[PDB]
Amino acid sequence: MQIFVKTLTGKTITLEVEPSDTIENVKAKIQDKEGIPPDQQRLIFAGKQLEDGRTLSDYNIQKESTLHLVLRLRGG
Ligand SMILES: [Zn+2]
Numbered sequence: 905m906q907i908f909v910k911t912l913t914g915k916t917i918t919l920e921v922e923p924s925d926t927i928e929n930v931k932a933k934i935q936d937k938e939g940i941p942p943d944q945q946r947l948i949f950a951g952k953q954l955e956d957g958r959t960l961s962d963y964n965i966q967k968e969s970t971l972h973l974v975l976r977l978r979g980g
């Protein structure tokens with residue numbers, strides 16, 4: 905099962921996920937691929953910012969769904 909994650913630069917990465925993966929889990933897969941710490945990541949789906957403890961299934965995120973990755977300003 906695959907989802908796409910688009911960054912502000914237009915670049916897209918593909919993650920292998922499961923319906924019961926938490927948002928925490930997705931951030932960890934993004935850290936593995938891109939080396940960005942989870943606390944710097946905000947994930948958005950359907951215009952809504954996803955919360956760490958909820959699952960992809962909670963949010964009706966399906967195969968081939970696209971999430972948007974917004975980075976926190978390092979140092980705020
Ligand atoms: Zn998983």
Ligand SMILES: [Zn+2]
Binds near residue numbers: 968
């Ligand atoms: Zn398809």
